[PDB]
Chain A
Amino acid sequence: VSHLSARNIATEALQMKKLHQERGGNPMLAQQARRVLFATSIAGQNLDARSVALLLNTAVYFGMESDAKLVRECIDYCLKNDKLITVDVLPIVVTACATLKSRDAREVIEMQAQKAARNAKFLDAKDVTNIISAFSKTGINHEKLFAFLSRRVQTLARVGEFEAAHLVILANAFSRLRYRDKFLFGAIARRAMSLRERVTVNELVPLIVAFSKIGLKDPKLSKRFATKAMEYVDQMNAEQVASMFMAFAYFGIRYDQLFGVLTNRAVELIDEFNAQYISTTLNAFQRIGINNPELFDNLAERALAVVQDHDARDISKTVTALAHFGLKDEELFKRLASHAASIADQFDAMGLVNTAHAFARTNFLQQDMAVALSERSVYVCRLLDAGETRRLLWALAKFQVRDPKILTPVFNRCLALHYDFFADPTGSEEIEEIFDFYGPNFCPPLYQLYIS
C-alpha cells in the first residue's frame, strides 16, 4: 500500500465506503479502511480539490473525529483554497463537515452555503439533489438558500429532468429540513406521476414516507398514494410494511380498505418482523389510534421471541404502545424491564422518561429497572421539557425513590421551568400526586409555587 499515491488512496477509500454503506456493513472493510486512513497525510504533494474532498469524506465517514491529522489537513486545505471547491465537490465537503462540529467546520459550512446560494441558478439535475442532500445532513437555517434550491428544482422538474432516485433524495432532503413548500412537493408528486412505471416498490415507499413526514395537510395526495400503494402490497417487504404503517399513521387520515390489506400482509410476514418493525407498527397504531387486538396479539408474541434484539428506542416505543392500549403481557413486560435495566445507559433524553412513565403508568414495579433508570435519570435532567420533567418526576415518585442525589437535578429542572411546569392542565392530577408523596418538606419553594 506504500506504492499507492494519495490520489489512489482516495479512490480506494471511496470504493471501500461505497461497499461498506450499501453492500453490507462488513467490519473487515471498516477496520482495513480505518487502518489505511490512519497513516495518510496531505503534505508535500499537490492534490486536486476532488482528491482532498474524497479523503476528508471517507475519513469522516469511518468514525474519524475533528482531532485527527488527516481531517485537520483536509479542513485546512478547504479554507485556504475555497474557490477550488467547485459545485462538483461542494456536496462532498458539506457532507464531511456535517457531523464535524467545530469552528473551522462551521466556517466551511457557512462559506459553502453562501457559494451554493450564489450559484443556485446554474446547477443541473445532479448538482441540485447532491447539494440539497448534503445540506440536509448538516443542521442549517439558511432559508434563502433552500428557497433558491427549491426554485431551481421546480424549474428543472418542469421539463422532466429527475429520475425516481432523484425524486426520493430530493423529497427526503427537503422533508429533513422541515421546509414546507406546497408547490415544490406538488411538483415532486407530479414528477412521480409522470415517471409512472419507473417508480418501483423500493422507490415508492420512501417517497410516501418523506411526503408524510413533512405534513402538508393535503388529503388530495394521501388518497392517491394509498391507491397507488394498494396494488404494491403483495410485493412489499416487512420493512416496507412497517414504514407504510408509520407513514399512513403520520398522514392521519383513515383508510380502512388499505389498513386491512396492510394488516393481512403483516400477519403473513409475522416470522420476518424484527424488534424495530414491531415497535414501528405499534407506534403507528398508537398514533393513528386504531385498536386491533388480533394483530396486537401476534405482534406481542413475536416480540417475546426477539427480546434480546430490542434497542432502547424499541423498548421505549413498544412499552409505551402496549401501555396506551391497556394490553397485559406479564412475561413480555418482565423481560423488557430486565433488558432495559441491562442497557440503561443507552437511553436518550426522551426514551428514558418515556420508558419510566410507561412502566409506572401500568401497575408494574421492578427494582432492577427502577433503580437503573432512576440512577440514569441524573444525566438527562438538563435536556428535558417542563412536561417531560413533570412526567419523569411522577414516574420517579411512583417508584418510591428518595435519594437526594437523584431528586435534586429533577427538582432544579422543574424549578427553572416552573411557569410551564404549572401551566399544563392535563398534568394537574399528576401534580397533586407528586406532592402527596413527597410532602411540603421536600423542596419547599416548589410547594410554595404550587400553592399559589
Chain B
Amino acid sequence: SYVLKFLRGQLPEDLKDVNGALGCLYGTLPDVDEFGQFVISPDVVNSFHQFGYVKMPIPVLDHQQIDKLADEVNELANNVEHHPKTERLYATSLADLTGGPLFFCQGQWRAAWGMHDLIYLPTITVAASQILNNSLVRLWYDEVFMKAARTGPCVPWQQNYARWQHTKPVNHVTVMIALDTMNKDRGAPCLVPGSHRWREGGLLPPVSYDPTKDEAHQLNTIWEIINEEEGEMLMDTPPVTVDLRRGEALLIHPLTLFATHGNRSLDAVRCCFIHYMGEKTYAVQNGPLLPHTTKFQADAMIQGPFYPVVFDPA
C-alpha cells in the first residue's frame, strides 16, 4: 500500500505484529553465538527442581529500566485518560471503568513498549529454556499487578496450572519480577517449598475466596484444601516469604502453591508475571485459549503471532 509520508515511522496497531523485539530497554538482542553469557549455574536449576521455585542471583534490569517499566504500569491504570491500545489486552481491571484497590492487567506486551521488550529479555528467557529442558521458549501470556497503599488486598493460595487446564501437558514456568521493593507488609510472594510434587503432580482443589475479611484468615485458608500428610509436610516446612528487591526475579513452577501478601505500606506496589511454555505443548479442545485469539483444533501444537518464540537453542 502507500504509507503516507507522516505515517512511515509509525508502529503496528498492536505490538503483536512487531516481529522480534524493539530496541528500547537493552538495545538489540545479541547474536546467535552470544547467548551463552546469560546461562545460569546448574545448582540454580537443581534448587528450582527441589524447592519448586528459585530466586535468580542477579537483578535482571537496571534501576532506570525498572523506573521506565513502572511508568508503563502507572500509565496502564490511568482511569482518567485511558491507555491507548486498551482493547489490545486480554483482560483489565478497569473494564468496569472504576478499578479498585487492586489493578490487574493481562496481555500488556501488545500495548506498551518495554513490556513488549521484557518478553525477549535474554536474562530470564535463557533461564526459562534451561528450566524447560533446553527447548524452544514461547510466551504464554503476561500479567501486571498493582496494589494501592494501605488498602491493597492479597491473592490467596492458588496454583497457576489450575487456570491453564485447556493446555494438555504441564510444560510451563512463571517468572515474577518485582518492579518495587517488596516485603511481608507489601506484596511479597509466599510459596510452599516442595508443593509441586504433592498429589503425584496433581492439582489441589480450589480455595474458597470470601472477600472483605482480614489477611490472616485469607492466608490461613491453606488448612482446608490439604490432607493429613500434606499437613505434616506443612508442619515440617511452613510457607516462606521471599523478599524481593527493585529488579529481582523469581522462577516458579506451575504446580507450586503460591500466594501474594497484602499492601500495608504508604505507596503502591507493582509486579509483573510472565508465563513461558515449551515447544511440545498442545491444546485439549476446539477453540481459542485466550479471548480473541487464533483457534486450534484437537491436539494442535500451540503456535502463532499471539505466542511468539522468544528463544531457540539451535
> Which residues in A have some Cβ–Cβ distance to B below 8 Å?
17, 20-22, 25, 30-32, 34-35, 38-39, 61-63, 65-69, 95, 98-99, 102-104, 137, 276, 311, 313-314
Contact = CB atoms under 8 A, between A and B. Distances in A.
Contacts of B8: 20-21, 25
Nearest to A62: B9
A39 B76 CA distance: 19
Nearest to A279: B1
B68 A38 contact: yes
Consensus secondary structure, chain B interface: loop
B24 A38 contact: yes
A71 to B, nearest CB: 10
Nearest to B113: A38
Interface in B67-101: 68, 71-72, 75-76, 78, 81, 83-85
A342 B229 CA distance: 54
A62 B28 CA distance: 17
A34 B64 contact: no
Interface of B: 1-2, 5-11, 22-24, 27-28, 64, 68, 71-72, 75-76, 78, 81, 83-85, 112-114
Nearest to A35: B23
Contacts of A68: 113
A92 to B, nearest CB: 11
Contacts of B23: 31-32, 34-35
A63 B24 contact: no
Contacts of B84: 65-67, 102
A34 B112 contact: no
A225 to B, nearest CB: 21
A39 B75 contact: no
B24 A35 contact: yes
B85 A65 contact: yes
A62 B114 CA distance: 15
Contact of B1 (A17, A69, A313): A313
Residue among B6, B81, B114 with the most chain A CB within 10 A? Answer: B6
B237 to A, nearest CB: 44
A66 B113 contact: no
Contacts of B22: 31, 34
30 contacts: A20-B9, A21-B8, A22-B5, A31-B28, A34-B23, A34-B24, A35-B27, A38-B24, A38-B113, A38-B114, A39-B64, A61-B6, A61-B9, A61-B10, A62-B9, A63-B9, A63-B10, A66-B84, A67-B72, A67-B76, A67-B112, A69-B71, A95-B6, A98-B6, A99-B7, A99-B10, A102-B84, A103-B81, A276-B1, A313-B1
A99 B2 CA distance: 17
Contact of B9 (A17, A103, A137, A311): A17
A154 B8 CA distance: 32
Nearest to A22: B5
B1 A21 contact: no
Contacts of B72: 67
A63 B6 CA distance: 11
Contacts of A95: 6
B239 to A, nearest CB: 38
Consensus secondary structure, chain A interface: helix
B81 to A, nearest CB: 6
A98 B7 CA distance: 11
Contacts of B68: 38-39
A380 to B, nearest CB: 13
Contacts of A276: 1-2
Nearest to A61: B9
A314 B2 CA distance: 11
A135 B249 CA distance: 48
B269 to A, nearest CB: 21
A221 B6 CA distance: 30
A349 to B, nearest CB: 14
Contacts of A104: 81
A137 B24 contact: no
B83 A67 contact: yes
B81 A30 contact: no
Given A34-B23, A314-B1, A102 B113 contact: no
Nearest to B83: A67
A406 to B, nearest CB: 13
Contacts of A38: 24, 68, 113-114
Nearest to A20: B9
Nearest to A69: B71
A145 to B, nearest CB: 20
A29 to B, nearest CB: 9
B297 to A, nearest CB: 12
A34 B18 CA distance: 14
A311 B1 contact: yes
B5 to A, nearest CB: 6
Contacts of A39: 64, 68
A132 to B, nearest CB: 14
Contacts of A66: 81, 84
B11 A63 contact: yes
Nearest to A17: B9
Contacts of B5: 21-22
Contacts of B9: 17, 20-21, 25, 30, 61-63
Given A34-B22, A66-B84, A311-B1, 15 more contacts: A17-B9, A21-B5, A22-B5, A31-B22, A35-B23, A35-B24, A38-B113, A39-B64, A39-B68, A61-B6, A63-B9, A65-B84, A67-B72, A67-B83, A95-B6
Contacts of A17: 9
A25 B27 CA distance: 19
A68 B75 CA distance: 8
Nearest to A30: B9
